[PDB]
Amino acid sequence: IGAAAISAVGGIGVGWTLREFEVVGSDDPAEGLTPDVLRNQLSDSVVKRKSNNQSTMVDNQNILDGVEHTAYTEAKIAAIEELNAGSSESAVLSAANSAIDSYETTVRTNFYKSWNETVRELEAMTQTVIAHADVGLSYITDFGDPRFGNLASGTSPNTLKDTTVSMPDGTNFTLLTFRHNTGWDSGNAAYSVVEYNPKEVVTSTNSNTYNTVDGTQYMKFSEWNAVETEMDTVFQNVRNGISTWVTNVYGDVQSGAIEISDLVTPRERATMMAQEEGMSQAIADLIALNVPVDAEREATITIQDTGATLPGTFALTDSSDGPLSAGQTYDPSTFSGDVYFTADMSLVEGPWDAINSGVDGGTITITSEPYEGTAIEVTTVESETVSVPAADWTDNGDGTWSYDASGDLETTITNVDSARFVSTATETTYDTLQLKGAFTVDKLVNKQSGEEVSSTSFTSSEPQTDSNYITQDEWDQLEQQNKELIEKYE
Protein backbone atom coordinates (compact mmCIF):
# COMPACT_ATOMS: atom_id res chain seq x y z
CA ILE A 1 0.00 0.00 0.00
CA GLY A 2 2.53 2.58 -1.29
CA ALA A 3 2.31 5.90 -3.22
CA ALA A 4 3.61 7.54 -6.45
CA ALA A 5 1.02 9.21 -5.56
CA ILE A 6 -0.84 6.47 -7.48
CA SER A 7 -2.34 3.80 -5.10
CA ALA A 8 0.50 1.45 -6.38
CA VAL A 9 4.00 0.54 -4.93
CA GLY A 10 6.47 2.26 -7.27
CA GLY A 11 10.12 1.89 -8.24
CA ILE A 12 10.38 -1.93 -8.43
CA GLY A 13 13.02 -3.35 -7.71
CA VAL A 14 13.43 -7.06 -8.59
CA GLY A 15 17.03 -7.42 -9.94
CA TRP A 16 18.19 -8.60 -6.48
CA THR A 17 16.79 -12.08 -7.45
CA LEU A 18 19.04 -12.29 -10.59
CA ARG A 19 22.19 -10.16 -9.93
CA GLU A 20 24.36 -8.68 -7.16
CA PHE A 21 22.28 -5.74 -5.85
CA GLU A 22 23.88 -2.59 -4.40
CA VAL A 23 22.15 -1.18 -1.28
CA VAL A 24 20.85 2.43 -1.06
CA GLY A 25 22.94 4.42 1.47
CA SER A 26 21.86 6.57 4.47
CA ASP A 27 21.34 10.38 4.40
CA ASP A 28 23.27 12.24 7.15
CA PRO A 29 21.55 15.46 8.48
CA ALA A 30 23.51 18.69 9.26
CA GLU A 31 24.86 19.49 12.80
CA GLY A 32 23.37 23.01 12.83
CA LEU A 33 19.72 21.93 12.58
CA THR A 34 16.35 22.81 14.19
CA PRO A 35 14.40 20.05 16.12
CA ASP A 36 11.37 20.52 13.75
CA VAL A 37 13.70 20.14 10.68
CA LEU A 38 15.63 17.14 12.15
CA ARG A 39 12.27 15.40 12.89
CA ASN A 40 11.07 16.06 9.28
CA GLN A 41 14.39 14.80 7.79
CA LEU A 42 14.32 11.64 10.00
CA SER A 43 10.65 10.93 9.09
CA ASP A 44 11.53 11.37 5.37
CA SER A 45 14.48 8.92 5.65
CA VAL A 46 12.23 6.27 7.30
CA VAL A 47 9.50 6.75 4.60
CA LYS A 48 12.19 6.52 1.83
CA ARG A 49 13.79 3.37 3.41
CA LYS A 50 10.40 1.63 3.90
CA SER A 51 9.33 2.54 0.30
CA ASN A 52 12.66 1.20 -1.09
CA ASN A 53 12.42 -2.02 0.99
CA GLN A 54 8.72 -2.50 -0.10
CA SER A 55 9.53 -2.00 -3.83
CA THR A 56 12.49 -4.47 -3.63
CA MET A 57 12.55 -7.20 -0.91
CA VAL A 58 9.37 -6.89 1.23
CA ASP A 59 6.47 -6.60 -1.36
CA ASN A 60 7.57 -8.84 -4.31
CA GLN A 61 6.61 -12.14 -2.57
CA ASN A 62 4.73 -13.67 -5.55
CA ILE A 63 7.81 -13.48 -7.88
CA LEU A 64 9.70 -16.02 -5.70
CA ASP A 65 8.28 -18.95 -7.81
CA GLY A 66 10.38 -17.34 -10.59
CA VAL A 67 13.51 -17.70 -8.38
CA GLU A 68 12.71 -21.47 -8.27
CA HIS A 69 12.40 -21.40 -12.13
CA THR A 70 15.77 -19.51 -12.47
CA ALA A 71 17.45 -21.94 -10.02
CA TYR A 72 16.07 -25.00 -11.94
CA THR A 73 17.24 -23.59 -15.34
CA GLU A 74 20.77 -22.96 -14.05
CA ALA A 75 21.10 -26.32 -12.15
CA LYS A 76 19.65 -28.43 -15.02
CA ILE A 77 22.09 -26.88 -17.57
CA ALA A 78 25.04 -27.64 -15.18
CA ALA A 79 23.70 -31.24 -14.73
CA ILE A 80 23.14 -31.85 -18.52
CA GLU A 81 26.81 -30.87 -19.23
CA GLU A 82 27.98 -33.42 -16.61
CA LEU A 83 25.49 -36.14 -17.88
CA ASN A 84 26.77 -35.65 -21.46
CA ALA A 85 30.39 -36.14 -20.20
CA GLY A 86 29.37 -39.62 -18.85
CA SER A 87 30.13 -38.51 -15.24
CA SER A 88 29.11 -40.20 -11.93
CA GLU A 89 25.68 -39.36 -10.41
CA SER A 90 27.54 -37.53 -7.54
CA ALA A 91 29.48 -35.39 -10.10
CA VAL A 92 26.19 -34.54 -11.95
CA LEU A 93 24.51 -33.44 -8.65
CA SER A 94 27.74 -31.64 -7.62
CA ALA A 95 27.61 -29.41 -10.76
CA ALA A 96 23.84 -28.75 -10.33
CA ASN A 97 24.06 -27.96 -6.60
CA SER A 98 27.17 -25.77 -7.12
CA ALA A 99 24.98 -23.68 -9.49
CA ILE A 100 22.18 -23.50 -6.82
CA ASP A 101 24.88 -22.64 -4.14
CA SER A 102 26.12 -19.59 -6.09
CA TYR A 103 22.57 -18.47 -7.03
CA GLU A 104 21.17 -18.83 -3.45
CA THR A 105 24.23 -16.99 -2.00
CA THR A 106 23.59 -14.02 -4.35
CA VAL A 107 19.81 -13.85 -3.55
CA ARG A 108 20.33 -14.31 0.23
CA THR A 109 23.35 -11.91 0.42
CA ASN A 110 21.29 -9.20 -1.42
CA PHE A 111 18.31 -9.73 0.91
CA TYR A 112 20.40 -9.67 4.17
CA LYS A 113 22.52 -6.74 2.84
CA SER A 114 19.35 -4.55 2.55
CA TRP A 115 18.27 -5.54 6.13
CA ASN A 116 21.78 -4.65 7.42
CA GLU A 117 21.59 -1.21 5.75
CA THR A 118 18.07 -0.54 7.23
CA VAL A 119 19.33 -1.49 10.70
CA ARG A 120 22.68 0.46 10.26
CA GLU A 121 20.71 3.55 9.16
CA LEU A 122 18.48 3.38 12.28
CA GLU A 123 21.66 3.33 14.46
CA ALA A 124 23.10 6.31 12.45
CA MET A 125 19.75 8.17 12.94
CA THR A 126 19.77 7.23 16.68
CA GLN A 127 23.38 8.57 17.04
CA THR A 128 22.27 11.88 15.36
CA VAL A 129 19.29 12.30 17.83
CA ILE A 130 21.72 11.55 20.75
CA ALA A 131 24.12 14.28 19.41
CA HIS A 132 21.50 16.98 18.55
CA ALA A 133 19.83 16.49 21.99
CA ASP A 134 16.71 18.65 21.12
CA VAL A 135 14.89 15.55 19.79
CA GLY A 136 14.09 12.61 22.06
CA LEU A 137 14.96 8.95 21.39
CA SER A 138 11.19 8.21 21.62
CA TYR A 139 10.92 9.93 18.21
CA ILE A 140 13.37 7.62 16.28
CA THR A 141 13.33 4.37 18.37
CA ASP A 142 9.75 3.48 19.42
CA PHE A 143 9.30 -0.27 19.93
CA GLY A 144 6.22 -0.16 22.23
CA ASP A 145 7.30 1.63 25.44
CA PRO A 146 9.75 4.46 24.46
CA ARG A 147 10.70 5.48 28.05
CA PHE A 148 14.46 6.24 28.13
CA GLY A 149 14.66 7.70 31.68
CA ASN A 150 17.31 5.23 33.01
CA LEU A 151 19.48 5.20 29.81
CA ALA A 152 23.00 6.74 30.27
CA SER A 153 23.95 9.95 28.37
CA GLY A 154 25.65 9.35 24.98
CA THR A 155 24.61 5.66 25.00
CA SER A 156 22.45 4.15 22.24
CA PRO A 157 19.46 1.93 23.27
CA ASN A 158 20.39 -0.17 20.16
CA THR A 159 23.01 -2.93 19.70
CA LEU A 160 23.87 -4.33 16.23
CA LYS A 161 24.94 -7.91 17.00
CA ASP A 162 27.06 -9.88 14.50
CA THR A 163 25.28 -13.11 13.51
CA THR A 164 27.08 -15.63 11.26
CA VAL A 165 24.98 -17.02 8.36
CA SER A 166 26.38 -20.11 6.58
CA MET A 167 26.04 -19.35 2.86
CA PRO A 168 25.56 -22.45 0.64
CA ASP A 169 28.83 -21.72 -1.27
CA GLY A 170 30.81 -22.46 1.94
CA THR A 171 31.38 -18.78 2.87
CA ASN A 172 30.13 -16.90 5.97
CA PHE A 173 27.99 -13.74 5.90
CA THR A 174 27.58 -11.32 8.82
CA LEU A 175 23.85 -10.67 9.36
CA LEU A 176 23.13 -7.87 11.85
CA THR A 177 20.75 -8.86 14.65
CA PHE A 178 18.93 -5.78 15.90
CA ARG A 179 18.74 -5.55 19.72
CA HIS A 180 16.93 -2.64 21.46
CA ASN A 181 16.71 -2.06 25.24
CA THR A 182 15.13 1.16 26.71
CA GLY A 183 17.54 0.93 29.71
CA TRP A 184 15.41 -0.19 32.71
CA ASP A 185 16.37 -3.22 34.83
CA SER A 186 14.63 -6.57 34.51
CA GLY A 187 12.15 -6.23 37.34
CA ASN A 188 10.88 -2.76 36.33
CA ALA A 189 7.35 -2.52 34.81
CA ALA A 190 8.79 -0.24 32.05
CA TYR A 191 11.46 -2.87 31.03
CA SER A 192 11.25 -3.11 27.22
CA VAL A 193 13.64 -5.21 25.09
CA VAL A 194 13.40 -6.56 21.50
CA GLU A 195 15.97 -8.63 19.55
CA TYR A 196 15.31 -9.89 16.00
CA ASN A 197 16.42 -10.21 12.33
CA PRO A 198 14.68 -11.55 9.12
CA LYS A 199 15.33 -15.18 10.33
CA GLU A 200 13.95 -15.14 13.93
CA VAL A 201 12.77 -13.17 17.02
CA VAL A 202 15.39 -13.84 19.77
CA THR A 203 13.42 -11.97 22.59
CA SER A 204 10.39 -9.61 22.90
CA THR A 205 9.50 -8.25 26.36
CA ASN A 206 6.92 -5.35 26.38
CA SER A 207 7.98 -4.79 22.72
CA ASN A 208 6.93 -4.64 19.05
CA THR A 209 9.05 -6.42 16.38
CA TYR A 210 8.73 -3.23 14.25
CA ASN A 211 9.75 0.43 14.68
CA THR A 212 7.22 3.33 14.68
CA VAL A 213 8.63 6.71 13.48
CA ASP A 214 6.11 9.56 12.85
CA GLY A 215 3.20 7.08 12.43
CA THR A 216 5.18 4.90 9.93
CA GLN A 217 5.73 1.24 10.91
CA TYR A 218 8.86 -0.33 9.37
CA MET A 219 11.50 -3.09 10.09
CA LYS A 220 8.47 -5.41 10.48
CA PHE A 221 9.60 -8.93 11.39
CA SER A 222 6.35 -10.33 9.88
CA GLU A 223 7.20 -8.64 6.50
CA TRP A 224 10.95 -9.57 6.46
CA ASN A 225 10.41 -13.13 7.80
CA ALA A 226 7.69 -13.76 5.15
CA VAL A 227 10.30 -13.31 2.36
CA GLU A 228 12.87 -15.32 4.42
CA THR A 229 10.57 -18.37 4.94
CA GLU A 230 9.48 -18.21 1.24
CA MET A 231 13.16 -18.07 0.14
CA ASP A 232 13.82 -21.20 2.32
CA THR A 233 10.85 -23.00 0.69
CA VAL A 234 11.98 -22.09 -2.86
CA PHE A 235 15.63 -23.27 -2.45
CA GLN A 236 14.55 -26.45 -0.55
CA ASN A 237 12.15 -27.30 -3.43
CA VAL A 238 14.93 -26.70 -6.06
CA ARG A 239 17.50 -28.92 -4.28
CA ASN A 240 14.99 -31.73 -3.54
CA GLY A 241 13.55 -31.33 -7.05
CA ILE A 242 16.98 -31.46 -8.76
CA SER A 243 17.81 -34.58 -6.69
CA THR A 244 14.55 -36.30 -7.87
CA TRP A 245 15.27 -35.00 -11.43
CA VAL A 246 18.84 -36.44 -11.63
CA THR A 247 17.74 -39.75 -9.94
CA ASN A 248 15.06 -40.29 -12.66
CA VAL A 249 17.17 -38.83 -15.60
CA TYR A 250 20.54 -40.52 -14.87
CA GLY A 251 21.17 -43.32 -17.39
CA ASP A 252 18.02 -43.09 -19.57
CA VAL A 253 18.69 -39.60 -21.05
CA GLN A 254 21.51 -40.41 -23.58
CA SER A 255 24.83 -38.46 -23.39
CA GLY A 256 24.54 -35.89 -26.21
CA ALA A 257 20.69 -35.85 -26.56
CA ILE A 258 20.49 -32.26 -25.11
CA GLU A 259 23.14 -29.66 -26.16
CA ILE A 260 22.82 -26.45 -24.09
CA SER A 261 26.58 -25.43 -23.81
CA ASP A 262 25.92 -22.14 -25.81
CA LEU A 263 22.36 -21.39 -24.43
CA VAL A 264 21.56 -17.76 -23.42
CA THR A 265 19.36 -18.14 -20.31
CA PRO A 266 16.53 -15.61 -19.56
CA ARG A 267 18.64 -14.53 -16.48
CA GLU A 268 21.79 -13.95 -18.70
CA ARG A 269 19.57 -12.09 -21.27
CA ALA A 270 18.24 -9.60 -18.61
CA THR A 271 21.73 -8.97 -17.06
CA MET A 272 23.06 -7.98 -20.55
CA MET A 273 20.10 -5.48 -20.72
CA ALA A 274 21.49 -3.85 -17.50
CA GLN A 275 24.93 -2.96 -19.04
CA GLU A 276 23.22 -2.02 -22.38
CA GLU A 277 20.13 0.28 -22.35
CA GLY A 278 17.10 -0.61 -24.55
CA MET A 279 14.14 -1.16 -22.11
CA SER A 280 13.29 -0.67 -18.35
CA GLN A 281 15.21 -3.24 -16.19
CA ALA A 282 12.24 -4.40 -14.05
CA ILE A 283 10.05 -5.70 -16.94
CA ALA A 284 13.23 -7.46 -18.36
CA ASP A 285 13.70 -9.01 -14.87
CA LEU A 286 10.00 -9.97 -14.53
CA ILE A 287 10.30 -11.71 -17.98
CA ALA A 288 13.53 -13.53 -16.79
CA LEU A 289 11.54 -14.76 -13.71
CA ASN A 290 8.84 -16.11 -16.11
CA VAL A 291 6.04 -13.78 -14.87
CA PRO A 292 3.06 -13.79 -17.36
CA VAL A 293 3.29 -10.47 -19.34
CA ASP A 294 1.23 -8.79 -22.14
CA ALA A 295 3.76 -7.55 -24.75
CA GLU A 296 1.34 -7.26 -27.75
CA ARG A 297 -1.13 -4.71 -26.20
CA GLU A 298 -0.91 -1.21 -24.57
CA ALA A 299 -3.42 -0.35 -21.82
CA THR A 300 -4.62 3.18 -20.97
CA ILE A 301 -5.42 2.90 -17.24
CA THR A 302 -7.19 5.40 -14.92
CA ILE A 303 -6.97 5.31 -11.09
CA GLN A 304 -10.41 5.67 -9.42
CA ASP A 305 -9.52 7.63 -6.19
CA THR A 306 -6.67 9.73 -7.80
CA GLY A 307 -8.10 10.51 -11.27
CA ALA A 308 -4.65 9.92 -12.88
CA THR A 309 -4.52 8.28 -16.35
CA LEU A 310 -1.52 6.33 -17.77
CA PRO A 311 -0.63 4.28 -20.90
CA GLY A 312 1.38 1.09 -20.29
CA THR A 313 1.96 -2.69 -20.36
CA PHE A 314 0.61 -5.19 -17.75
CA ALA A 315 2.17 -8.20 -15.91
CA LEU A 316 0.34 -10.73 -13.68
CA THR A 317 2.14 -13.15 -11.27
CA ASP A 318 -0.97 -15.40 -11.57
CA SER A 319 -2.52 -15.47 -15.12
CA SER A 320 -5.69 -17.00 -13.49
CA ASP A 321 -6.45 -13.40 -12.28
CA GLY A 322 -8.44 -13.53 -15.56
CA PRO A 323 -8.37 -11.30 -18.65
CA LEU A 324 -8.19 -7.53 -18.02
CA SER A 325 -10.98 -6.29 -20.31
CA ALA A 326 -11.46 -2.67 -21.49
CA GLY A 327 -14.35 -0.79 -19.84
CA GLN A 328 -14.05 -2.91 -16.66
CA THR A 329 -12.93 -1.76 -13.16
CA TYR A 330 -10.56 -4.03 -11.14
CA ASP A 331 -9.63 -4.09 -7.41
CA PRO A 332 -6.14 -5.72 -7.00
CA SER A 333 -6.87 -6.45 -3.30
CA THR A 334 -9.32 -9.23 -4.44
CA PHE A 335 -6.74 -10.81 -6.87
CA SER A 336 -4.77 -14.05 -6.15
CA GLY A 337 -1.44 -12.65 -7.44
CA ASP A 338 0.07 -9.18 -7.95
CA VAL A 339 -0.52 -6.73 -10.84
CA TYR A 340 2.52 -4.96 -12.26
CA PHE A 341 2.17 -2.00 -14.58
CA THR A 342 5.15 -0.66 -16.55
CA ALA A 343 4.53 2.88 -17.81
CA ASP A 344 6.23 6.04 -19.09
CA MET A 345 5.83 8.23 -15.98
CA SER A 346 6.34 11.45 -18.03
CA LEU A 347 2.76 10.88 -19.39
CA VAL A 348 1.00 10.91 -15.92
CA GLU A 349 -1.98 13.33 -16.11
CA GLY A 350 -5.36 13.82 -14.40
CA PRO A 351 -7.89 16.45 -13.25
CA TRP A 352 -7.30 18.43 -10.03
CA ASP A 353 -10.81 19.24 -8.70
CA ALA A 354 -9.59 19.95 -5.09
CA ILE A 355 -8.91 23.70 -5.72
CA ASN A 356 -10.50 26.96 -4.40
CA SER A 357 -12.22 29.20 -6.99
CA GLY A 358 -10.81 32.52 -5.73
CA VAL A 359 -7.35 33.81 -6.71
CA ASP A 360 -6.94 36.51 -4.03
CA GLY A 361 -3.94 38.83 -4.55
CA GLY A 362 -2.28 36.18 -6.74
CA THR A 363 -2.65 33.39 -4.15
CA ILE A 364 -4.05 30.01 -5.37
CA THR A 365 -5.30 27.56 -2.68
CA ILE A 366 -5.79 23.75 -3.05
CA THR A 367 -7.74 21.52 -0.57
CA SER A 368 -5.55 18.32 -0.97
CA GLU A 369 -1.82 17.43 -0.78
CA PRO A 370 -0.01 17.96 -4.15
CA TYR A 371 1.60 14.78 -5.56
CA GLU A 372 5.42 14.44 -5.55
CA GLY A 373 6.95 14.60 -9.06
CA THR A 374 3.85 16.36 -10.54
CA ALA A 375 2.95 19.98 -11.22
CA ILE A 376 -0.58 21.41 -10.84
CA GLU A 377 -1.39 23.41 -14.01
CA VAL A 378 -3.90 26.06 -12.87
CA THR A 379 -5.91 27.82 -15.61
CA THR A 380 -7.64 31.06 -14.58
CA VAL A 381 -10.95 32.52 -15.90
CA GLU A 382 -8.79 35.11 -17.87
CA SER A 383 -7.32 32.15 -19.89
CA GLU A 384 -3.88 32.32 -18.17
CA THR A 385 -2.07 29.21 -16.96
CA VAL A 386 0.55 28.71 -14.23
CA SER A 387 2.46 25.44 -13.66
CA VAL A 388 3.14 24.87 -9.96
CA PRO A 389 5.36 21.85 -8.99
CA ALA A 390 4.33 20.16 -5.66
CA ALA A 391 7.52 21.48 -3.87
CA ASP A 392 6.42 25.15 -4.43
CA TRP A 393 3.02 24.65 -2.63
CA THR A 394 3.20 26.07 0.94
CA ASP A 395 1.38 23.98 3.64
CA ASN A 396 -1.07 26.09 5.74
CA GLY A 397 -1.68 23.21 8.21
CA ASP A 398 -5.47 23.75 7.68
CA GLY A 399 -5.64 20.81 5.28
CA THR A 400 -5.01 23.43 2.54
CA TRP A 401 -1.89 24.35 0.46
CA SER A 402 -1.26 27.75 -1.19
CA TYR A 403 1.07 29.33 -3.84
CA ASP A 404 1.66 33.05 -4.71
CA ALA A 405 1.37 33.42 -8.51
CA SER A 406 1.68 37.28 -8.50
CA GLY A 407 4.87 37.01 -10.61
CA ASP A 408 3.40 34.40 -13.00
CA LEU A 409 -0.13 35.87 -13.73
CA GLU A 410 -1.04 39.17 -15.49
CA THR A 411 -4.35 39.39 -13.55
CA THR A 412 -3.70 38.36 -9.93
CA ILE A 413 -7.33 38.94 -8.76
CA THR A 414 -9.30 36.34 -10.70
CA ASN A 415 -10.88 32.84 -10.40
CA VAL A 416 -9.78 29.27 -11.27
CA ASP A 417 -11.46 27.93 -14.45
CA SER A 418 -9.93 24.44 -14.15
CA ALA A 419 -6.80 22.67 -12.85
CA ARG A 420 -4.99 19.47 -13.86
CA PHE A 421 -1.87 17.67 -12.63
CA VAL A 422 0.83 16.66 -15.12
CA SER A 423 4.31 15.01 -14.64
CA THR A 424 7.43 17.18 -14.06
CA ALA A 425 9.60 14.63 -16.02
CA THR A 426 11.76 16.36 -18.68
CA GLU A 427 12.16 13.09 -20.69
CA THR A 428 10.53 9.63 -21.14
CA THR A 429 11.13 7.86 -17.79
CA TYR A 430 9.94 4.23 -17.52
CA ASP A 431 8.91 2.75 -14.15
CA THR A 432 7.35 -0.53 -12.91
CA LEU A 433 4.50 -0.10 -10.38
CA GLN A 434 2.64 -2.78 -8.35
CA LEU A 435 -1.03 -1.57 -8.59
CA LYS A 436 -2.65 -1.84 -5.12
CA GLY A 437 -5.72 0.35 -5.58
CA ALA A 438 -8.76 0.13 -7.89
CA PHE A 439 -8.14 0.91 -11.57
CA THR A 440 -10.27 1.00 -14.73
CA VAL A 441 -8.95 -0.18 -18.13
CA ASP A 442 -10.01 2.62 -20.55
CA LYS A 443 -8.68 1.19 -23.86
CA LEU A 444 -6.42 -1.65 -25.13
CA VAL A 445 -4.23 -0.67 -28.14
CA ASN A 446 -2.79 -3.66 -30.11
CA LYS A 447 0.70 -2.73 -31.41
CA GLN A 448 1.82 -1.99 -34.11
CA SER A 449 -1.62 -1.81 -35.88
CA GLY A 450 -3.25 0.48 -33.24
CA GLU A 451 -6.46 -1.66 -33.10
CA GLU A 452 -8.83 -1.45 -30.08
CA VAL A 453 -9.19 -4.93 -28.47
CA SER A 454 -11.69 -6.08 -25.77
CA SER A 455 -9.41 -8.30 -23.53
CA THR A 456 -5.71 -9.07 -22.68
CA SER A 457 -3.59 -12.19 -23.45
CA PHE A 458 -0.66 -13.04 -21.16
CA THR A 459 2.29 -15.26 -22.15
CA SER A 460 5.05 -17.17 -20.25
CA SER A 461 7.42 -20.12 -20.90
CA GLU A 462 6.86 -23.69 -19.50
CA PRO A 463 7.39 -23.63 -15.66
CA GLN A 464 10.28 -25.84 -14.52
CA THR A 465 9.44 -28.96 -12.44
CA ASP A 466 11.37 -31.85 -10.83
CA SER A 467 10.63 -33.97 -13.99
CA ASN A 468 10.54 -31.68 -17.10
CA TYR A 469 13.11 -30.13 -19.58
CA ILE A 470 14.18 -33.63 -20.78
CA THR A 471 13.76 -32.88 -24.51
CA GLN A 472 15.75 -30.38 -26.66
CA ASP A 473 12.41 -28.89 -27.87
CA GLU A 474 11.50 -27.79 -24.28
CA TRP A 475 14.91 -26.03 -24.06
CA ASP A 476 14.74 -24.57 -27.63
CA GLN A 477 11.27 -23.10 -26.81
CA LEU A 478 12.66 -21.56 -23.55
CA GLU A 479 15.33 -19.51 -25.46
CA GLN A 480 13.00 -18.71 -28.46
CA GLN A 481 9.91 -17.66 -26.36
CA ASN A 482 12.19 -15.46 -24.16
CA LYS A 483 14.24 -13.75 -26.96
CA GLU A 484 11.06 -12.81 -28.90
CA LEU A 485 9.54 -11.37 -25.66
CA ILE A 486 12.62 -9.07 -25.16
CA GLU A 487 12.35 -8.03 -28.90
CA LYS A 488 8.65 -7.00 -28.33
CA TYR A 489 9.72 -4.43 -25.67
CA GLU A 490 12.42 -3.08 -28.06
Author numbering: 9 to 498
Give the text the authors published on this PDB structure.
Haloarchaeal pleomorphic viruses (HRPVs) infect archaeal hosts living in hypersaline environments. Here we describe crystallographic structures of VP4-like spike proteins from two pleolipoviruses, HRPV-2 and HRPV-6, showing that these proteins have a unique fold, different from class I–III fusion proteins. VP5 is thus a bona fide fusion protein.
This was facilitated by Volta phase plate technology, which provided sufficient contrast in the tomographic reconstructions for identification and alignment of the relatively small VP5 (~57 kDa) spikes. We fitted the VP5 X-ray structure into the 16-Å resolution VP5 tomographic density as a rigid body. Although the fitting is generally robust (cross-correlation coefficient 0.84), there is additional density in the groove between the N- and C-terminal domains, which slightly protrudes from the EM density, suggesting that VP5 attached to the viral membrane may adopt a more compact conformation than in the crystal. The C-terminus is proximal to the viral membrane, consistent with the predicted C-terminal transmembrane region anchoring VP5 to the membrane. Density corresponding to the last 39 residues of HRPV-6 VP5 is not observed: the 23 residues preceding the very last two C-terminal asparagine residues correspond to the TM domain, and the preceding 19 missing residues (glycine rich) would act to link the ectodomain to the TM domain.
